[PDB]
């Protein structure tokens, strides 16, 4: 019933995997990076990285491992998607035509089976005899690596240990042996099993169960010289190999948790380690050749190298050049100097690759052109906290403004040529009683500073204290110039005051434009919030002044401008405030809901409300009555991340398993039963996690209405930095473009031979249906990159409905100009 079109404005920028090897040819060294659905292949030069190929898949890349079976010139690439698509890929070049061929493929999903808490784990035996997958608790899938197995037929093996945390394949074992850390009631332990392809069963491993530390989180297989494995936990690093079990907790590491690793020496003598706070370490495995050729491990030593961006994964290339794959901030290349610099760091940044990071809020502003809008986002977390300015190249031009603290919300106040941003920085409890900052960030290094006067809850204060060392986050409201982007003022909120919502608008008869923030007093023993404020600020003459301070009974999750009035949501209440002439907030309306009013979008007198469990609710302000009345609803439980009003009748939301959905006001609604029920009319597996929805376009808005083929324009920012745009269509275009999609699928070569319809099929852990009401804009726009012979294959025997009378064979030239019309929406 709703015909919507969805297209990528910015591919996912966040890195979630990386491996090195010889994939293009046996000689040159490759670096392969996974950016969610994208896969980038590089060649390691002495200068930097020479890009070679970049391909996309019909799936979220969950496993990516190189390996060279016996009788192969170069490595093969194994990938496993989020929907459990398996495949082995080969790099093939014929002069200058680069193509990734699908040697074998298949889906390895099991009907029935609990997806493990630890997620998908994929490991390949170092002798390339087999692939092991840990997909479900209590099972271990084994794919035997035969030239015969082109469909990847596999078998599961009963696994008595249910809560497995990590598993690797061990080097230098008679039979393929797996080593894993699991948990049972007595704590965590490490155990080994041999895998028999003949018996299709488990056998006793080389060295039986051993007890490990409480927080054992990582297993590293150590190459052939050593044998055995290294287990990294929260405070210890241990090496185990049957006879020996060495564990060290050097003081340099106790302060942080290690989350990623990578091997430096091919024999395993050194490893790179990165923690949650950006630190970088080096681990040394001391050897002893003991004549024979039997090297025995003697000790373990750790050195602090320096600080990098918060690393999701690491990979050593060569000549001390290391690729830092980051999810929260920019990915980097760093040099490892043998001799320190003046700061003490042996690491030096070489290149910086932009990562729009986690986009947690954004807005569109025209800013300077007065014709072309620009997108300013809240990207990254912690020291990687940043703003980003995205605009069209006049391709995408991105300018970065680092904050060194986490930004939460952003909104634009044209009246004072600046932005309002809510941010939070981490401080540590001081022995004096106060708190100590970790580094100077945007809120600390501001020109002007202020703290709100402890008034309402200065007398109403609960008795509790914070222990030394505890991390406690302080919230600020930042004012940022719209040109230079420096922090003009930083208002610090009360202690334990948590800032949730922020808006900039004019209220009532008042012509002043205000910064309104909704807060919530967050205490640890207090589970649901019982105290919060709505503060009205005014920014005038470089100084920020508190105008009004309105206490509420709970958390102000959302606020919107509602035709001259302030529409706030306190827990389950939808309260409407009015701006008195005495410049104070006076309650006019209340509406008490069945759900917590977390998501709030408004169009005129309609209000769209949503909670975290995909409970969609539609309210309307009745002017004569002076209160709220419910219109319709659709409560289907599922996790929901953001929501937006397309038009008066359509509603767009993003829900669990990276899906998109459209709920629609039921036409032909005769009963008050079906009037008051919204029908799900569109479902789509986007592959990304949507955090924020925004009306606007990054193109020249086009003054004279030049028969815009689409109606509406909604942008959205995701966790992996992907920025997308959604727009509505007409019935004839949807029906046409849909038939375009199904013809393209027949001629298009899918990486890994994944069926497009399967990739976009609405998927959750329980339910999996096909996609409706959504056109894959990225698939349509790919029509321009195929050859004219493939276009003639696509258009062959294809009619439109133009006039309901002139349906004729679409020429490839008619159709080419059509897709060009669609590329112009971003």
């Amino acid at each position: 019933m709703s015909y919507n079109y969805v297209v990528t404005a910015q591919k996912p920028t966040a890195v979630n995997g990386c491996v090195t090897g010889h994939f293009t040819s046996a000689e040159d060294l490759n670096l392969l990076i996974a950016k969610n659905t994208r896969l980038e292949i590089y060649v390691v030069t002495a200068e930097g990285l020479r890009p070679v190929k970049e391909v996309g898949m019909y799936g979220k890349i969950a496993v990516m491992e190189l390996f060279r079976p016996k009788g192969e010139s170069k490595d093969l690439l194994f990938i496993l998607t989020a929907k459990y698509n398996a495949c082995i890929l080969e790099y093939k070049q014929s002069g200058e035509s680069i193509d990734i061929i699908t040697r074998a493929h298949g889906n390895v999903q099991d009907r029935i089976g609990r997806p493990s808490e630890t997620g998908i784990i994929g490991i390949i035996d170092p002798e390339c005899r087999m692939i092991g997958l840990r997909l479900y608790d209590g099972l271990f899938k084994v794919i035997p690596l035969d030239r015969d197995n082109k469909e990847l037929k596999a078998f599961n093996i009963r696994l008595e240990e249910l809560h497995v945390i990590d598993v690797k394949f061990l080097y230098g074992c008679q039979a393929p042996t797996i080593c894993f850390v699991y948990q049972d009631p007595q704590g965590r332990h490490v155990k080994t099993y041999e895998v028999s392809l003949r018996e299709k069963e488990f056998n006793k491993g080389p060295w039986k169960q051993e007890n490990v530390e409480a927080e054992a989180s990582m297993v590293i297989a150590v190459p052939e010289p050593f044998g055995g494995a290294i287990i990294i936990g929260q405070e210890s690093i241990t090496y185990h190999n049957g006879d020996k079990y060495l564990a060290i907790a050097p003081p340099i590491i106790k302060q942080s948790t290690i989350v990623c690793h990578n091997r430096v020496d091919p024999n395993g003598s050194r490893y790179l380690l990165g923690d949650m706070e950006g630190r970088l370490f080096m681990l040394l495995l001391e050897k002893e050749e003991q004549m024979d050729g039997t090297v025995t491990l003697k000790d373990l030593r750790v050195e602090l190298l320096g600080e990098t961006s918060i690393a999701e994964c690491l990979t050593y290339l060569d000549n001390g050049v290391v690729f830092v794959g980051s999810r929260l901030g920019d990915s980097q290349l760093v040099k490892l100097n043998v001799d320190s610099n003046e700061q003490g760091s042996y690491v030096v940044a070489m290149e910086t690759f932009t990562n729009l990071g986690p986009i947690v809020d954004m807005c569109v502003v025209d800013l300077e052109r007065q014709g072309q809008g620009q997108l300013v986002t809240c990207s990254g977390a912690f020291k990687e906290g940043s703003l980003r300015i995205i605009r069209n190249g006049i391709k995408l031009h991105i300018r970065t403004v680092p904050l060194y603290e986490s930004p939460r919300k952003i909104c634009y106040q044209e009246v004072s040529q600046c932005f309002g941003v809510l941010s939070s920085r981490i401080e540590v409890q001081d022995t004096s009683g106060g708190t100590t900052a970790l580094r100077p960030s945007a809120s600390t290094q501001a020109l002007s500073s202020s703290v709100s006067s402890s008034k309402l809850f200065s007398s109403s204060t609960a008795p509790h204290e914070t222990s030394f060392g505890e991390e406690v986050e302080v919230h600020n409201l930042l004012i940022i110039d719209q040109h230079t982007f420096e922090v003009l003022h930083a208002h610090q909120f009360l202690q334990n005051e948590y800032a949730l919502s922020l808006v900039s608008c004019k209220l009532g008869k008042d012509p002043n434009t205000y910064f309104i923030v909704g807060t919530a007093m967050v205490y640890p023993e207090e589970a649901e919030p019982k105290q919060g404020r709505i503060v009205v600020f005014q920014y005038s003459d470089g100084k920020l002044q508190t105008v009004a301070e309105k206490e509420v009974k709970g958390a102000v999750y959302s606020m919107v401008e509602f035709n001259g009035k302030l529409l706030a949501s306190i827990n389950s209440t939808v309260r409407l405030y009015e701006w008195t002439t005495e410049k104070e907030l006076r309650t006019e309306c209340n509406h008490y809901n069945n759900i917590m009013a977390l998501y709030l979008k408004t169009k005129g007198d309609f209000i769209l409300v949503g909670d975290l469990m995909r409970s969609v609710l539609l309210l309307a302000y009745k002017p004569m009555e002076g209160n709220f009345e419910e219109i319709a609803r659709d409560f289907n439980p599922n996790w929901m991340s953001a929501v937006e009003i397309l038009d008066d009748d359509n509603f767009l939301g993003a829900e669990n398993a990276f899906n998109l959905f459209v709920c629609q006001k039921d036409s032909a609604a005769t009963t008050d039963e079906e009037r008051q029920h919204l029908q799900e009319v569109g479902l789509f597996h986007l592959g990304e996690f949507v955090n924020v929805f925004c009306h606007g376009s990054l193109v020249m808005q086009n003054l004279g209405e030049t028969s815009t083929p689409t109606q509406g324009s909604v942008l959205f920012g995701t966790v992996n930095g992907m920025i997308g745009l959604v727009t509505s269509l007409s019935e004839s275009w949807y029906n046409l473009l849909l038939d375009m999609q199904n013809r393209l699928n027949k001629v298009i070569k899918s990486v890994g031979k994944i069926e497009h319809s399967f990739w976009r099929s609405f998927h959750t852990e329980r339910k999996t249906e096909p996609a409706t009401g959504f056109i894959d804009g990225d698939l349509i726009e790919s029509f321009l990159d195929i050859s004219r012979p493939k276009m003639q294959e696509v258009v062959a025997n294809l009619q439109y409905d133009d006039g309901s009378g002139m349906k004729r064979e679409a020429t490839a030239d008619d159709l080419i100009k059509v897709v060009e019309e669609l590329t112009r929406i971003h």
Binding site: T118, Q234, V522, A527, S572, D611, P637, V719
Partner: protein, 374 residues
């Protein structure tokens, strides 16, 4: 074994006419059948699926029902009691459903076309942003399995930070995700049920949150029309949330025995001495009473004349007070002897005779409808 239909499918299964009480899945239902058509129809179920329907009536007199629960028989025995030959049958609630049609047969037994409502199971809220490297820090180093070490919110605080570490990737904080986290919601309930009545939490309550939510829906002190709301919810999370909102709305106390008489509200409580509002007092015959002091109480009759004999609050004379409806003992009315006494009249209710309930608005002048939260 176990006969279970598929989700969202249409099924046509019989309804027993004698039954009326709402059946929550999981709890057991014992029945006593005398009529031969009831027995004959049950006997035929033992051969086939062994499942029948138990409706959740909104008005039992008119027999109005929109939902209900399937009941699977698991015990059958032809007994004798009081010179009557009766069959005693035990069934268990299984699936929920939505009422479609109520065609009544030639017998008194009536069939019911119905659509199976599925139990909505959601993966971890953070599972939605992919199980990456901070995943290995998602699992916990066992539980403390200590009543006093796991009451340590130091443990529950470390639980929140670690389970919801990825909260900073989204637009909401960790503490919001705790408000939708089952384990947290469960322990929030347990702490309040133990507040109502001391009892062993480990044995009495199931560990699974689906089993927990339903089990609590049965034992909650609420009207069966209100209980229909809980039967509608498909997500154990929304169910646990709703039960917490109810528990917070049970601000009044009624007669534990008849449960038809609202005695007093929590507002009327007050601490007479530093001892507290509630304390344990003894009478001259060795009987121990946990007594709650409240300013005002109603729907009570007095017994005998006032006496200062062995009064727990000198300056006041007690008069035995009992329920208007069932005459079970509720406590005493305390009346001052002199004029300089501060409250002059108050009430001493014994705790074991009370039971918390939602304040009903039987006065139809201002009946604002109770809205439950999800």
């Amino acid at each position: 074994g176990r006969t279970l239909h598929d989700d969202d499918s249409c099924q046509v299964i019989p309804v027993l006419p004698q039954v009326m009480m709402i059946l929550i899945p999981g709890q057991t239902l014992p029945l006593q059948l005398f009529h031969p058509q009831e027995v004959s129809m049950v006997r035929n179920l033992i051969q086939k699926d062994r499942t029948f329907a138990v409706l959740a009536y909104s008005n039992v007199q008119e027999r109005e029902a929109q939902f209900g629960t399937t009941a699977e028989i698991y015990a059958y025995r032809e007994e004798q009691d009081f010179g009557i030959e009766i069959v005693k049958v035990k069934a268990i609630g299984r699936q929920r459903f939505k009422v479609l049609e109520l065609r009544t047969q030639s017998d008194g037994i009536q069939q019911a076309k119905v659509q199976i409502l599925p139990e909505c199971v959601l993966p971890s809220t953070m599972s939605a942003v992919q199980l990456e490297s901070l995943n290995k820090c998602q699992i916990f180093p066992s539980k403390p399995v200590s009543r006093e070490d796991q009451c340590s919110y130091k443990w529950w605080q470390k639980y929140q930070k670690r389970k919801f570490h990825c909260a900073n990737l989204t637009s909401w904080p960790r503490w919001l995700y705790s408000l939708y986290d089952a384990e947290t919601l469960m322990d929030r309930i347990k702490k309040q049920l133990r507040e109502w009545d001391e009892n062993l939490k480990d044995d009495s309550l199931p560990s699974n949150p689906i089993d927990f939510s339903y089990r609590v829906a049965a034992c909650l002190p609420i009207d069966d029309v209100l209980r229909i709301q809980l039967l509608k919810i498909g997500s154990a999370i929304q169910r646990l949330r709703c039960e917490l909102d109810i528990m917070n709305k049970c601000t009044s106390l009624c007669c534990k025995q008849c449960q038809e008489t609202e005695i007093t509200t929590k507002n009327e409580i007050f601490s007479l001495s530093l001892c507290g509002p509630m304390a344990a007092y003894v009478n001259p015959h060795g009987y121990v009473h946990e007594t709650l002091t409240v300013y005002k109480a109603c729907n009570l009759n007095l017994i005998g004349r006032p006496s200062t004999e062995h009064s727990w609050f000198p300056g006041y004379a007690w008069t035995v007070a009992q329920c208007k409806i069932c005459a079970s003992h509720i406590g005493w009315k305390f009346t001052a002897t002199k004029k300089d006494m501060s409250p002059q009249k108050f009430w001493g209710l014994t705790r074991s005779a009370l039971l918390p309930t939602i304040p009903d608005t039987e006065d139809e002048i201002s009946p604002d409808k109770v809205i439950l939260c999800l």
